[PDB]
Amino acid sequence: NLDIIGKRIEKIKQEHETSWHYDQDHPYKTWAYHGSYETKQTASSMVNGVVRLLTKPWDIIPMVTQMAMTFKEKVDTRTQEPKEGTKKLMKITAEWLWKELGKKKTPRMCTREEFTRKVRSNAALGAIFNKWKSAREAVEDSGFWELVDKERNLHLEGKCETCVYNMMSRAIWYMWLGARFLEFEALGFLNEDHWFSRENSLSGVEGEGLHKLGYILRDVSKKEGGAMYADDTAGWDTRITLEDLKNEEMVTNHMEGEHKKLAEAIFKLTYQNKVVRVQRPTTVMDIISRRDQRGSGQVVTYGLNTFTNMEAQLIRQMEGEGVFKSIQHLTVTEEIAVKNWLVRVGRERLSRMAISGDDCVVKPLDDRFASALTALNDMGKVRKDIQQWEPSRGWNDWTQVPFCSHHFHELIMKDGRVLVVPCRNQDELIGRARISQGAGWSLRETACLGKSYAQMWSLMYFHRRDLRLAANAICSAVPSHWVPTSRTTATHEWMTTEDMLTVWNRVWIQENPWMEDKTPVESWEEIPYLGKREDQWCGSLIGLTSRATWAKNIQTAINQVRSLIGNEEYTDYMPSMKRFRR
Ligand SMILES: CC1=NN(c2cccc(N)c2)C(=O)C1
Ligand SMILES: [Zn+2]
């Protein structure tokens, strides 16, 4: 309690001594409340005019148009302490999993240089505004790095002064850049050195890319076993227990010297004890604390979510196989059986999973998994939209399974080669591309964001008739040489000025380990679509009058956007499609 957080709290009080007050009408039950002070402030979604002018049929589709308009009663909840048998299963599995992840990797500190190049290339690091304007400016200024040193030496001393969360089923906890640096220094290696790559972690998909996920699910399908299970957790981040935070901290056991002390401090002082500042309109700043739940940087969060999810799912698999009888208490022979299971088949059981943070797909040994619920419920990883003790409903076809907001189709090319392609409801794809984040976008910057969406569609969703046509139209409407941009940046092979047919060949043929025949594709017409009926099932407007007028008159929409942007060098990509090829 207050010895670890007091200094952070004491320091905040003094900068707002002309406001402090212990309010007695504070809404917090599960968050420890400390005091309040005076403020007054709020970022809504803006429409991308280049994308919207080139997708006119969707102007009358509510699922698209509503996306551009616009629970914290889940953050103020508590999770019970697991039983002793559950805690033992988790500690033993966590110990074994950090060992496996560490067999071919070396933990190491990330550097001011690595951090500097990150901010100078626009990764969403979740910092705040204040003494410097942007993150770009603070990084080129030794004043900052002296503040970072003060905090750093404080951490080595086992104390914290300035590592405070700012709160804003989504809730994102910004820290000042300096705090983000010390987190990145201690734990950035997990992401930077690909600890959750498939090659290293066997369940993981970190860095795989949306063009590999479908092939990965198909490889899991090839295993002998039961249905494929894809149970979502109800508010994963709010269900992370202090016991989970302590099993995650065991990664420091693989570390040494300075690194071990810096990493232990981030875990102790910022994760297992948190200080948070929240806005309350009643507008005061509430300074609140708690020990449990997830509040890290979004990238360390991804890695620790993958870790703890892998652990939970192996334990659920153990329960389905009857490795242990009861979560109440693990016998001594049951611990030995859990350890022997992990040594004998642990790696085979990891390869039956695809896990991305809180998202998973498991192909267990058989369907006893469906009703193995006691450990999963007692760890607090309660399934979304199903009664606590109702058995999971599995999928019989890998092309039906949901994963990372997608499903995957098997698509046979005119030459017999097999593509496994990602897909989702087309209203979701068009609706997202019509949205921009932030203020002060020039027309040029708005056009270059539209071009990023268009190139993503050409690479990933080429098999959707409407998206190949709209992607070609947007690339025709934006100057040929203008570089695709994004303000928050899986692999992103569409972020290039190289010709998209050449990128398609590299991604889908040359570098695709599931394609034996490396014969390049010579034109877009060699690259197939979904069946017309499947395309309509996944949201295509093919067959509608509005869509036929749009397609036929597309050069008029292209010329409207060219006229707005002005006298520039443009390319006509529309003859890359059969129907416009004369
Ligand atoms: C663009 C281009 N597309 N084509 C093309 C592609 C496939 C078949 C046919 N007949 C033509 C070109 O010759 C140039
Ligand atoms: Zn600190």
Ligand SMILES: [Zn+2]
């Ligand atoms: Zn689909």
